[PDB]
């Protein structure tokens, strides 16, 4: 079912994280857009699975306007490009975005993909690719929670590349007193987004782990219940590691509902 995985000891750090296992996060998905006229296909941004044929990621991550059949959605994927082999690939039926999407703030960044296949069911569950468990309206992880992300997104703003080996990092869900424009360069936090990050510093210069350009759609799981649980969804950041600045995430609870009605057979 959800939130279970033969997770395993990363071994192969990163700035930024450390490599990972698609064992480890089967809920990772690989989001690919093809440019014009099929030149090949371009790693976008990731998804977080939450049923058989349905996938949910960032909203600015299809600003675009791609044309549904131009997006192909991977799942049980080790390596962004390199095929696996229990790997499992679908084409994008049809996908909605949050009609609210604020552009300018990332306000509502969320989006749901549709898997498609001639039948009611598309991804089969598998060591790979497994779904995560939404969290429940009334879950409140306490301050500080240890959580951790995935992704194949870039190793820091500036590198012209994505990670050829899914990374994943481990934060801190903040307290909302420290998730606030204030702390992030005055930019806008709206009640729909939540702060996690490395609390680590100090020490001549760290690898801090946070996710970066190429991890949206991406999750951010904490434990909860004894399984892994969706918390929120990678949207946006300063940078990618900056000391005492978190990363900003989708407050996954809040869109629960919206999650729901936009799954209509
Ligand atoms: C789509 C997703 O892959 C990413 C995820 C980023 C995750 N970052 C993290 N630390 N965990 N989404 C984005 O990159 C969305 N855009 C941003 O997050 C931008 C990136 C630009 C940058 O390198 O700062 N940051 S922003 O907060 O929305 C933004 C920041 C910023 C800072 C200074 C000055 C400006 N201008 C141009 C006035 C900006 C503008 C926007």
């Given at each position: 079912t959800c939130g279970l995985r033969q997770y395993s000891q990363p071994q192969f750090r990163i700035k930024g994280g450390l490599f990972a296992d698609i064992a480890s996060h089967p809920?990772?998905?690989a989001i690919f857009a093809k440019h014009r006229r099929s030149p090949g296909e371009r790693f976008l941004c990731g998804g977080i699975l939450i049923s058989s044929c349905w996938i949910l990621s960032a909203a600015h991550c299809f600003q675009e306007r791609f044309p549904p059949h131009h997006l192909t959605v991977i799942?049980?994927?080790?390596?962004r490009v390199v095929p696996?082999?229990?790997?499992?690939?679908?084409?994008?039926?049809?996908?909605?975005?949050?009609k609210?999407?604020?552009?300018?703030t990332y306000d509502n960044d969320i989006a749901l993909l549709q898997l498609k296949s001639d039948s009611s069911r598309c991804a089969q569950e598998s060591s790979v690719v497994r779904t995560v468990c939404l969290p429940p309206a009334d879950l409140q992880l306490p301050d500080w929670?240890?959580?951790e992300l995935s992704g194949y997104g870039k190793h820091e703003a500036l590198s012209?590349?994505?990670?050829?080996?899914?990374?994943?990092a481990h934060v801190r869900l903040y307290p909302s007193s420290r998730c606030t424009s204030q702390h992030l360069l005055n930019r806008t936090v709206t009640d729909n987004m939540l702060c996690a990050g490395d609390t680590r510093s100090g020490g001549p210069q760290a690898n801090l782990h946070d996710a970066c350009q190429g991890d949206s759609?991406?999750?951010?799981?904490?434990?909860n219940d004894g399984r892994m649980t969706l918390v929120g969804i990678i949207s946006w950041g300063l940078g990618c590691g900056q000391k005492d600045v978190p990363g900003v995430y989708t407050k996954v609870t809040n869109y629960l509902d919206w999650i729901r009605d936009n799954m209509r057979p």
């Open positions: 809920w990772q998905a799942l049980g994927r080790t390596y696996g082999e229990e790997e499992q690939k679908f084409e994008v039926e049809k996908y909605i975005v949050h609210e999407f604020d552009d300018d929670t240890e959580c012209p590349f994505y990670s050829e080996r899914l990374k994943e759609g991406g999750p951010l799981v904490c434990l």
